[PDB]
UniProtKB/Swiss-Prot annotation, chains A, B, C, D, E, F, G, H, I, J:
The record marks M35 as: Susceptible to oxidation. It is found in: Cell surface. Cu(2+) 2 binds at H6, Y10, H13, H14. Glycans are attached at Y10. Changing H13R: Only 23% zinc-induced amyloid-beta protein 28 aggregation. Changing A21G: In AD1; Flemish mutation; increases the solubility of processed amyloid-beta peptides and increases the stability of peptide oligomers. The chain holds residues 672 to 707 of 770 of the full protein. The record marks G33 as: Implicated in free radical propagation. This is Amyloid-beta protein 40. Changing G33V: Reduced protein oxidation. No hippocampal neuron toxicity. Changing R5G: 60-70% zinc-induced amyloid-beta protein 28 aggregation. The record marks D1, A2, D7, S8, K16, L17, F19, F20 as: Cleavage. Zn(2+) 2 binds at H6, Y10, H13, H14.
Length: 36, 36, 36, 36, 36, 36, 36, 36, 36, 36
């Protein structure tokens, strides 16, 4: 048998100025800020 | 048997100016800031 | 048997100016700042 | 049997100016700042 | 049996000017600053 | 994130003679061969 | 992140004569052959 | 990050005569052959 | 990061005569052959 | 980083006569042959 526990702490604060903001806790796909 | 525990601390703050911001806790795919 | 524990501290702050910011706690895929 | 614990301290601060910033705690894939 | 503990201190600060910055705590793959 | 896979192979054969046989793949409770 | 895999091989054969047989792959509770 | 794999080989054979047999691959609780 | 692998070979055979047999691959609890 | 591998060979055979047999590959708890 097997017991599994997991804690993932994700935090972010005080983004005064930003033109493209992308805060993702976990990704398994495609993340694009800008594409043509 | 096997017992597994994991702690992943992710934090970020005070981003005064940035044109492309991408904060990802964990990635298993594709991350692109800009593509054509 | 086997007991496993892991602590991964990821932090970053005070990014005054940056054109491409990519903060990733852990990566197992592709990370590209810019591609054509 | 075997007991495993691991502490990985990752920190970075005060990046006043940078055109391409890529802060990765751990990598097992491809990291590219710019490709054509 | 065997008990294992590990501490890896990674830190970096005050990067006033840099065109390509890549701060990686640990790498087991490919890291490229620029490729064609 | 975390991906977990586990393989537990349990097999037993050729028990010619036995008065009390108790073959359990995994136990988290009480197992008693005989009680009064 | 963390990837975990585990293989536990449990096998037993040719128990010609035994009055109390208790074959358990993994135990996290109480196992008693005989109690009063 | 951390990748963990574990192989635990448990085998036993040819127990011709035994009054109390208790074959346990892994134990985290109480095992008693006989109690009053 | 850290990669961990472990091989634990446990085997036992040819126990012709024994009144109390307790074969445990790994123990983290209490093992008692006889108690009152 | 750190890579860890471990091989623990445990074997025992030909126990013709024994009143209390306790074969444990690894112990981190209490092992008692007889208690009152």
């Amino acid at each position: 048998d097997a017991e599994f526990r997991h804690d993932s702490g994700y935090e972010v604060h005080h983004q005064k100025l930003v033109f493209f903001a992308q805060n993702v806790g976990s990704n398994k796909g495609a993340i694009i800020g800008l594409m043509v």
